[PDB]
Design a protein around this ligand. Structure first.
Ligand code: ADP
Ligand code: ADP
Ligand code: BEF
Ligand code: BEF
Ligand code: CO
Ligand code: CO
Ligand code: CO
Ligand code: CO
Ligand code: MG
Ligand code: MG
Lengths: 594, 609
């Protein structure tokens, strides 16, 4: 039933003309200045990056030719009456030939050419931002008209004025008195007048360009420029610099409880700092930077989903950037970086689990849901068991409240079998009285009390080739029976079985449950599943129950309901006993007729 | 105090040269191949889109006059090739050279302006070069219509040059062959190519065949007349967009042209949301024309339970066609959609209150979230309109709303009273309600566990302050409002017995309570705990509050306690401690009830003599 028409029918029956690829220049300018960025404000990022590059070239140049004590800075000026945005740097500037070439030609980058001639380990090779040759045209996004004044440091080269409206043509004339470097004046479109507002410019500068290495001034005022902590030696960073940097980078008001300052060079250059907040659960995630400039507020491809609880920053200088500079290209190197980072963070958290198990215990209670989620969603067994190292549970051999890893269980496994038995229960009381538990008379059972603990072990399957397997695979003798047959008569629509058990002392009764899909079904029903009473015939209230049933057919009932309800609370199946209170008050009142 | 260097000093000297912008073609080609599109797979979308446009041009050419218009895909694993062929209008030599041999030239842009339909996808003039993301050799065979035009083979590397020759066996339309480079062999996999078609091109308006088999392309339901869509078509479309197996309980098919173009459909699943899926964070797809535009940002966070699709011609596309421009435009779209969805949900409650009750039970958590996290009062109140409660002024819910409470308001009153309790019975016989019954105000009864928090965050509704019954009871102490006891003095403890009892209680509960007082406001309850900010206290207890213990000297239990302090004094202290615990539990201020059990059993044994 196939329908295909693709057929090898074509033969070239002629000569062979040869052409070169062309570019429609007019249209290309329109694209860059329109359908490139997601946001207009981004022209500021571009112009400042260009200023930085210009200064950085000048700094490189004065390593050999120096040295002027000329100051290296970027100035921004707003004029809200003329509707202009102006940016000036005191960098290397441009002569006439470099204005025509660099500005007049789309995709032509002088910074790229400058980078390509550097010794591969000169400092400028890491700090230069531009290489596409298009960012300057982002000015036409917001400006009807653009004027560039430029003075190069040269053979007393004259100053020059470049001007364009962005519609295919530009003018260049000689000028004075242009200061060494480059001044760019944007005559803003009516719809872009907001970029002649001081407060708005300031918002853009701090958003993208807050860690630019040269001083930024706006209307003669120094902006609050921060240090890119991630670029520095981890032992030149104090704990209290990390605290301030974290709050800034995470938009937080607490302190990091964990800090991982990670640096390396393969598969990519990476300078990064991760934080775990102290507070139990823009800057809602880890930010991506390249050469100290924001690429994405919320980095998408560099970390796994389950690690989204980390705050902080990743900076790579050779990460392949998309032309918009707000996305990353598809790369085997980005993929490897995510793998590398996943292991690095896992490794870091293990180490912390040893240094301070108590602090790690606190960490796990708060953020353990993410490990659980990670184990479930990632369909690769090798890493499921890498995330699983971070999990904690209680045990059938260890005291209540005390945590163990799978490792501390897998170690204590006898040479006999190679499979791990868990019992996922709402709490300790119910675990210790599971019939399935008592099957394990002698084997140790992991007690998994946390939400989705059952789900992860299901999705886990195996750990260290060991298998995860749910472990769910006085008063005479007729006085009791009479009382029993009587208790079954009032709890008809509630419990199923009323046993009698010789293992009670202070408690008159207790509730047990067989299968715990239903126990974890009740709750969360409230916003009736097979419970079982067990009676202590030695207890006074039970002995007081047996008698009163015939001496009081209106008061006893209260004593029965109460004993039942008290047992349900004791089992952790009723933590909001609001419904019993008024009744209990009736019981106490009727009891206290003395 | 200022440091500036920007001064108006620059003056033009002499004349000026005029210049035309230029372009560096080879680096441009490279930018398109390596830096333009985030994902390599997208060349399938770009080539299919070009095929769709060519078929529209031909369809429009063949309307003045009297072949099956289709797009064929073929994968050769052995040869490492990806092939696409459309039966479209084709290209002549001058077309191949000017349109394909020129970056940013768009024949599809010039065809449009020569109509003075809206089905043409291509405007940038660059989509075709996406092939060089995945291919180190591209051949193009094209036959124009009619036009007494010969066939042509276009071929490139593509770096700088391309050849153009005459070919003989060219079918009407265009065939393109990609010799896949080696890190891109996945695109000679049928299963892989198919994933991309259905991802980006699943609504193109011509049949697409892959290796001889027709792909299940769909109608763009959202662009069509709401009345022409059956319930069953919505069932199927829902399953596709939400990737689900159940059906929608509600369907909102929304169009609008002012203030912005909008073509959308939204669904609420019949299945309850997974609480795991709710906690973790993973929505709605965004489209232009009929091609998927990568994004999901469009709805406020509280409306993430919705599934379906949004299309708006007012969202312009970035060059890569995966990002959308105008971020404030989006906030407006988001505001419009939020407002429209609230209206829809309100109409659903009116139309079918039983069905809405099920919806509110399953999804209400989202509305409470939306109210708590929004900062705008009017948005919080808009969402609050969706909330449902019961009332003291109506039998068993019988679900009412804040608006309906407002309309029953008196002249008159400047407050909306509520009481949060876990069910209807407990509210009705709450000691806090017995106290409010002495007033003639209506009380909302709220049963969900996060209702309190929600109303605390809401604060007011339609300029009316929300006050919990518990709070109001405390404020009344400082208003010197007067109330009569529900029983006469004959069956209450005398004044002297009251204070005598109180001074004993204060001694027996020293660091546990601030005040202990008599209250004339209870009937069936012996006591209650009061705390001005009761709601905030309850919320704070999630892992001492200056509580007041108020007693009812008419209650037999309290009166009995008075007797016990001089009869069995030890028993009186155990009783007292139990009443306090009882009042704490009933106030919802207890911590963990288990350490009280053994204590309560000790109390029962002593009383049962
Ligand atoms: N402020 C400036 N000072 C000196 N030269 C500049 C300045 N801005 C731009 N240039 C030159 O113009 C070229 C093009 O700028 P741009 O369009 O941003 O491309 P790139 O990606 O190379 O930065 C730069 O490579 C640089 O040579
Ligand atoms: N399959 C095709 N059939 C006919 N013409 C085509 C085809 N593919 C491309 N073209 C022509 O080449 C031009 C450039 O295509 P493309 O690079 O996608 O830019 P755009 O599609 O945005 O115009 C198109 O405008 C169209 O005129
Ligand atoms: F600033 Be360039 F275009 F990368
Ligand atoms: F297909 Be075009 F590049 F919009
Ligand atoms: Co041949
Ligand atoms: Co080199
Ligand atoms: Co002037
Ligand atoms: Co009225
Ligand atoms: Mg640049
Ligand atoms: Mg196209």
């Amino acid at each position: 039933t196939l329908h295909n028409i693709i057929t090898d029918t074509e033969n070239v029956q002629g000569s062979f003309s040869k052409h070169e690829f062309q570019a429609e220049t007019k249209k290309l300018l329109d694209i860059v200045a329109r359908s490139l960025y997601s946001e207009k404000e981004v022209f500021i990022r571009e112009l400042i990056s260009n200023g930085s590059d210009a200064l950085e070239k000048l700094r490189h140049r004065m390593i050999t030719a120096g040295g002027d004590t000329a100051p290296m800075e970027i100035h921004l000026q707003t004029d809200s009456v003329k509707g202009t945005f102006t940016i000036q740097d005191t960098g290397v500037g441009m002569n006439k030939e470099d204005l025509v070439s660099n500005l007049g030609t789309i995709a032509r980058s002088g910074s790229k050419a400058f980078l390509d001639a550097l010794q591969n380990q000169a400092e400028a090779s890491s700090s230069i931002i531009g290489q596409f040759g298009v960012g300057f045209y982002s000015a036409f996004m917001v400006a009807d008209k653009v004027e560039v004044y430029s003075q190069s440091a040269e053979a007393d080269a004259p100053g020059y004025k470049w001007s364009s409206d962005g519609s295919g043509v530009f003018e260049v004339a000689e000028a004075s008195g242009v200061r060494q470097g480059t001044k760019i004046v944007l005559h803003l479109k009516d719809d872009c007048k907001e970029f002649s507002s001081e407060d708005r410019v300031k918002e853009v500068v701090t958003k993208y360009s807050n860690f630019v290495s040269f001083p930024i001034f706006l209307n003669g005022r120094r902006l609050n420029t921060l240090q890119a902590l991630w670029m520095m030696e981890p032992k030149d960073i104090s704990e209290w610099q990390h605290e301030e940097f974290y709050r800034y980078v995470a938009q937080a008001y607490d302190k990091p409880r964990y800090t991982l300052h990670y640096r390396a060079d393969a598969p990519l250059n990476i300078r990064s700092i991760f934080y775990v907040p102290e507070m139990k659960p823009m800057g809602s995630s880890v930010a991506l930077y390249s050469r100290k400039i924001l690429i994405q507020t919320k980095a998408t491809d560099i970390l796994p989903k389950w690690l989204r609880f980390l705050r902080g920053v990743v900076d790579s200088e050779d990460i392949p950037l998309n032309l918009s500079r707000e996305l990353l290209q598809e790369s085997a190197l980005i993929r490897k970086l995510r793998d590398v980072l996943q292991q690095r963070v896992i490794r870091f958290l293990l180490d912390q689990s040893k240094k301070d198990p108590e602090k790690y215990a606190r960490f796990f209670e708060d953020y353990g849901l993410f490990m659980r989620e990670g184990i479930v969603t990632t369909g690769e067994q090798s890493v499921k068991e890498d995330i699983a190292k971070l999990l904690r549970f209680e045990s059938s051999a260890l005291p209540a409240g005390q945590q163990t890893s799978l490792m501390e269980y897998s170690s204590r496994m006898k040479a006999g079998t190679r499979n791990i038995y868990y019992l996922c229960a709402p709490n300790r009381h119910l675990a210790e009285h599971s019939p399935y538990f008592e099957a394990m008379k002698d084997m140790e059972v992991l007690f998994c009390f946390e939400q989705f603990d059952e789900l992860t072990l299901l999705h886990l399957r195996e750990f260290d080739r060991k298998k995860l397997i749910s472990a769910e695979t006085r008063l005479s003798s007729e006085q009791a029976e009479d009382l029993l047959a009587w208790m079954r008569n009032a709890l008809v629509q509630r419990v199923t079985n009323i046993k009698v058990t010789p293992r009670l002392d202070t408690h008159p009764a207790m509730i047990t449950v067989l299968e715990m899909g239903a126990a974890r079904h009740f709750l969360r029903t409230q916003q009736i599943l097979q419970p079982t009473l067990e009676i202590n015939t030695g207890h006074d209230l039970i002995k007081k129950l047996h008698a009163l049933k015939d001496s009081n057919p209106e008061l006893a009932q209260l004593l029965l309901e109460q004993i039942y309800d008290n047992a349900m609370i004791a089992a952790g199946l009723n933590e909001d006993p609001r419904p019993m209170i008024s009744r209990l008050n009736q019981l106490l009142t009727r009891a206290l007729e003395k």
